[PDB]
Amino acid sequence: YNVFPRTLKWSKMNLTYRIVNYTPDMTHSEVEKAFKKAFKVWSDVTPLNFTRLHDGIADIMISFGIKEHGDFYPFDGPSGLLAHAFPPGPNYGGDAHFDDDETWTSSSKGYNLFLVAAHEFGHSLGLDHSKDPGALMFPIYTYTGKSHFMLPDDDVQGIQSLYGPGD
Amino acid sequence: YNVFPRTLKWSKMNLTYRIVNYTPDMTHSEVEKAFKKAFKVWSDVTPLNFTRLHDGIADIMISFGIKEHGDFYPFDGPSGLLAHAFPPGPNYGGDAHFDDDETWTSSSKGYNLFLVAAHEFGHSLGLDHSKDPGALMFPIYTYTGFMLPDDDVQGIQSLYGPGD
Amino acid sequence: YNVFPRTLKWSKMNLTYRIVNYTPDMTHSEVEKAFKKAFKVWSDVTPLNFTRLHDGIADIMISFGIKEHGDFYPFDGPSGLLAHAFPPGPNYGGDAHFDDDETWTSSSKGYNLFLVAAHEFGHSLGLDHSKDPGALMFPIYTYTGKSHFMLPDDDVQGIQSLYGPGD
Amino acid sequence: NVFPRTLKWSKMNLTYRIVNYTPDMTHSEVEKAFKKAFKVWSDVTPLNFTRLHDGIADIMISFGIKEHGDFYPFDGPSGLLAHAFPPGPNYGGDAHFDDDETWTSSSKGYNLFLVAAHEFGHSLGLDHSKDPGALMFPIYTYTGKSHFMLPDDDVQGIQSLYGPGD
Amino acid sequence: YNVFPRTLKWSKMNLTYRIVNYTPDMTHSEVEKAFKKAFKVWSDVTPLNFTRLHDGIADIMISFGIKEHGDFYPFDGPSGLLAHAFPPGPNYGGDAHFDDDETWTSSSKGYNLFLVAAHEFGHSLGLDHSKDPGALMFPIYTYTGKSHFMLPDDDVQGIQSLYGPG
Amino acid sequence: YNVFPRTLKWSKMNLTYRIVNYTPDMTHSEVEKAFKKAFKVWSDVTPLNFTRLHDGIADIMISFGIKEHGDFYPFDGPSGLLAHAFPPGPNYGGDAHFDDDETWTSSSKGYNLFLVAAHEFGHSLGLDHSKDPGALMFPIYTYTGFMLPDDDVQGIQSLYGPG
Amino acid sequence: YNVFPRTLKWSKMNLTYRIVNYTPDMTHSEVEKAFKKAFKVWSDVTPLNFTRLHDGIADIMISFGIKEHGDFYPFDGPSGLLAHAFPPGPNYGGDAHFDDDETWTSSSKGYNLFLVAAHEFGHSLGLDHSKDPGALMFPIYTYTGKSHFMLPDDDVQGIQSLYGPGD
Amino acid sequence: YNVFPRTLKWSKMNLTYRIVNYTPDMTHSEVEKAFKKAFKVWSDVTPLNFTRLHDGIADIMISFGIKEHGDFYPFDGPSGLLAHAFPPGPNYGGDAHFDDDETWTSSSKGYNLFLVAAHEFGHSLGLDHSKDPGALMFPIYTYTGKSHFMLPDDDVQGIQSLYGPGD
């Protein structure tokens, strides 16, 4: 027998991801680097392992799009909704979608891709929004100035309550 | 921080269902008898109860569709995915959809609607797949030569209790 | 790491079979009778039970075909290979295929369908060949001799090891 | 006399045959790649691999694109790179490589030696590993050559089946 | 004259419980599930019902501890005493303590927490030890079986002789 | 006065067993198969039923040891004493120990594991040695090139019935 | 021969600790992280080395309890007495008990476990209460906003007066 | 004439071992490999020489056992005591016993057999516990990530102070 899992989490540590397409706003390299760092934010404090896929179906499918892009959450043009991700689960579960009507950056201009990605992947991995205004999983985008990124305590605690700490 | 809390069991015991539409492959009466028996399997071995609504919103919405049918988990034509249901909860929770690109029957021909329904309803109530090859809740369809397998009676008595 | 775990035993006792199509050389009735007896031989010494389905998928799917007939284990025309069956488990598991470039009979002519099916069905259940020249499971086809079929002791003990004895 | 309990070879002496060759490498590069990939497994087991030039070998190696004679057609550049069948008769043990890939002796495209050593793990009865550092992990990763030492998880796996070498 | 009253059986069918602290051996949810299940064993066959408090004094206070842990009934390290519970009644009465020098599990390893907790709650509810070797209330821990816990007949009868049937 | 309790039979027909450790002489699979076979011998002619536990205390704990190995019934090195088991009952009751100074095999060589474990499990279930030279429960090991002899079928059915 | 040491202090630098049980109020990881940090405070300014045991008897046995928990210092329900620890020595010496009628947190709410454990581990190591209101060893709890934690000078001086500086 | 030696040490460089029995937890090969590696740790820095016996009485008799297993040191189920070894001498001297209520592994899961074995064979050769927390002979198990095994200097000195350096 088997009752459904008790919280939306991944029942495995090895996850894969795939950059289906790219934004016109940043170089391919910049985008790969942002996504890589965004995943490292979570793998650094957990036993989670992220392997990149070039083709095929990955657990976490990453795509850029505008307006209607193949689900019940169409984007809205510049500003407003920036991106979204589905919680752990089959098919669409874990997938992260980015509104390519935003201006995506590696800087303080427009919206920082690394930042929104890191936040969205919190969702992909089982985290909902935080009520702590300093948390990465706080609902509203904040850029606090480019520095060494250290995952806030609240987010470390949240992801650790699901997957444990890293070795 | 917050997680997503989960519904793993219907918080209540007077569950409702609605057959939204019907397959070409069987009469209305044949389909209704199949769904009724699929619910009887589970409600015999639990305190759960199932009431059918003809109109309106019910806990368990049953429907027949092909391909993309409004949930972004599309079906795939004949063979392959046979059906799917959603775990317990609000809205889409509990709903069961059958691929109407299969031939549904009351026998060994095509796929047996009672059998697949009985299985999908397992999901609707809190159950996931079983590792035991003889379980109704096994991932793979097999029509054997109906008493609910002991593995499934465990599965479901472990969420709702024996009843009575 | 992982291997492939195997099934060398139908985990259940109420097995189904289906005769998908028929040979030109015998009547439907003679064919069904040949298959019945081939199953009776195994189910007389074990707790195994066999049920015939007329449509749908059965554990043991029985079919007649020639040359490349849909598995990539093609047949070879008259003589040589006579039939084949797959070991227990899923899908193609348990299925038995007979070369219809053979002449199937219920006598000593051509190849006796009961005999070859009986031998094939051992595979479907969990037996490989023996080196006992008298056994039913023995690579080469020989038509004896005896004119009432009694299952040879090798095969009797062979299958009783996997499934247990009659009653 | 029941069926074996794992898909494994019931004999240590195995033969293989390179049926055809890729355009991307010289015959010698390919021979050396396959030779090395077998040597990965024979160095830690009592298994012995003997090349056949023609005829039927236990492990039949071929390059193809799209439909090539089984139920697993290749898909063009990228995606599926190759596959092998577990031990057994006929197609059992056979390894197929998608020649819509760019096969290399290097870090460019896909390394033939590396993919082959992975597929030959399957030909010998190993399924996928869940250790990200193992040869049998499902996803291709080239880590920079370097002397190849078979990761501990793949050593354990293959020896669980065939025992250690002399 | 006067005796000590009671009747070490609850005079009230509605009981509360509190998990005071947690063992290192299992996750919070596993512990909560194991105790939930152990209560349900008893509340399925009686008019008893159990409600969980997160704070305060409850009827059945549940804790893990080792050695001297506050009742002058010290635990003894690995093996031996696994846990104890006090007969029904105020204060220490009805409380269940679990020896955290045992390994607690939701399987056959160490000691199954649910299984011991079910036995212990039997004491909490008024049952002493049974001479029926097959009963939950038999003094000696034995892990069958037998998957899918159906309360043995002796314990069904035993508890119902105090509280009656459901 | 009081005596002690009866070591007659497992008051429950459903029993558990654990293979605590393994002999060098055979593989894990070969050993599991031998014990599975040895339990099947008895469970086919009774309503007894056997479940394998991979951890914890099981009714029948099975181990390989040599010389003195924790019960004060030490083994003797090669040959002679081959193994022993304890009459039904709690703790050590039902347990079977095998002398790992013997060579264990799935053949005529050394000592056939299945055959010795079938005999020992007969003790785990309440049978003593038989005076019937052809029985499994005869004291003296003999490998005769498997249907459970009549004397042992009667023996175990006179405790647990035919099932 | 030997005299009893002049201060209740450990005669070795390698000390072990065991977390006997856990609070309901925080995840296992949060509790481990808090004790580990609390010990790090003292090990960072001394040659003290703290080793975690999972079972058996450690020098510093840590448990959560309520009211009577097996010594002459029963707790008192919520608030009031939060925790206590024994000075160095055999048996109960070095042990730290925490009152589980408190609400233990990894934040500014309730009582911060790391903060209280660090103070109590000071007692475990031979420090008594300080008269310096800015000292961790000041008797009265005070939380001063999640910063990088720097052990105050008084506490540094107190523990060094016993064990000296490390490396 | 002769006096008993001044430490528990082997008065010969040729030592034999026998693996009496095996854990369910690992393959026969994984266990033999783990004990071989364990002995190499010590032979690599000494003149000591290790020969495996398959049958008979060896100097170092190795077994897996649970609870009472034939000496005055019964094991205690999962965790706690992992294994013990006797110091050099006749009979039980040098023998290593492993608690088979542990989960023995060839990785970082449960307890690593090679690691516990190497520690325990230190005892078998005449080392007691170190006070160095980074030493193999430190009393408490610690797995420091999988890397090439290089015996700490404290242990090299201990074993060399008994047997000298390998020539």
Ligand SMILES: Cn1c(=O)n(Cc2ccc(C(=O)O)cc2)c(=O)c2cc(C#CCc3ccccc3)ccc21
């Ligand atoms: C720790 N931390 C930082 O160091 N920095 C600076 C920073 C460092 C490095 C880079 C870079 O490598 O490009 C960029 C920015 C943040 O900006 C920040 C931001 C949030 C948030 C939120 C809320 C939210 C974000 C996104 C979407 C929705 C909500 C949480 C923590 C931090």
Ligand SMILES: Cn1c(=O)n(Cc2ccc(C(=O)O)cc2)c(=O)c2cc(C#CCc3ccccc3)ccc21
């Ligand atoms: C106990 N049992 C049976 O008696 N029969 C025969 C049977 C009896 C009565 C009717 C009828 O009233 O029309 C039909 C068929 C099954 O076929 C069967 C099948 C499975 C399964 C599974 C796995 C799975 C099923 C469906 C979907 C996915 C997976 C479990 C138990 C049984």
Ligand SMILES: Cn1c(=O)n(Cc2ccc(C(=O)O)cc2)c(=O)c2cc(C#CCc3ccccc3)ccc21
């Ligand atoms: C016991 N037995 C017989 O009594 N007879 C006579 C016989 C009796 C009854 C009928 C009938 O009812 O139609 C036919 C033939 C055999 O011929 C025979 C033959 C083999 C074989 C083999 C080897 C092999 C290899 C490959 C395929 C099939 C068989 C094994 C046993 C026996």
Ligand SMILES: Cn1c(=O)n(Cc2ccc(C(=O)O)cc2)c(=O)c2cc(C#CCc3ccccc3)ccc21
């Ligand atoms: C030990 N090891 C290495 O040293 N190197 C470097 C390396 C050495 C020598 C050559 C050469 O002679 O040409 C090339 C590369 C690897 O790249 C590697 C890679 C994997 C894998 C996997 C997973 C997977 C591979 C292929 C297909 C699918 C999955 C496991 C172990 C190692």
Ligand SMILES: Cn1c(=O)n(Cc2ccc(C(=O)O)cc2)c(=O)c2cc(C#CCc3ccccc3)ccc21
């Ligand atoms: C009916 N029953 C079982 O099905 N099983 C198996 C079992 C099923 C399900 C779970 C689970 O879901 O976690 C666990 C175990 C028992 O083990 C058992 C055990 C005792 C006893 C006693 C004596 C004693 C003494 C002291 C403490 C505990 C028990 C009575 C009845 C049963």
Ligand SMILES: Cn1c(=O)n(Cc2ccc(C(=O)O)cc2)c(=O)c2cc(C#CCc3ccccc3)ccc21
């Ligand atoms: C019926 N039976 C046999 O068929 N065979 C042959 C045999 C068949 C199959 C296998 C196998 O599957 O590996 C092995 C051996 C015996 O050897 C035998 C032996 C005893 C005895 C005793 C006395 C004693 C044995 C052990 C320990 C103490 C005393 C009783 C009955 C039988």
Ligand SMILES: Cn1c(=O)n(Cc2ccc(C(=O)O)cc2)c(=O)c2cc(C#CCc3ccccc3)ccc21
């Ligand atoms: C240096 N220091 C701080 O930086 N902070 C802030 C702080 C930093 C990090 C965390 C954290 O990681 O969660 C929390 C709080 C303190 O609050 C503090 C508090 C006391 C005290 C006392 C007195 C007493 C405490 C406890 C019990 C009894 C008495 C001494 C020093 C400090």
Ligand SMILES: Cn1c(=O)n(Cc2ccc(C(=O)O)cc2)c(=O)c2cc(C#CCc3ccccc3)ccc21
């Ligand atoms: C040098 N060294 C390491 O490199 N590694 C890593 C390591 C390398 C290779 C393998 C492997 O092949 O499986 C495993 C682990 C250790 O873990 C370690 C551990 C201790 C200790 C202690 C204390 C104690 C151990 C065992 C029992 C009791 C006490 C001392 C030194 C080292």
Ligand SMILES: [Ca+2]
């Ligand atoms: Ca996905």
Ligand SMILES: [Ca+2]
């Ligand atoms: Ca937008």
Ligand SMILES: [Ca+2]
């Ligand atoms: Ca854009």
Ligand SMILES: [Ca+2]
């Ligand atoms: Ca619904």
Ligand SMILES: [Ca+2]
């Ligand atoms: Ca379909």
Ligand SMILES: [Ca+2]
């Ligand atoms: Ca249809």
Ligand SMILES: [Ca+2]
């Ligand atoms: Ca089939």
Ligand SMILES: [Ca+2]
């Ligand atoms: Ca032919």
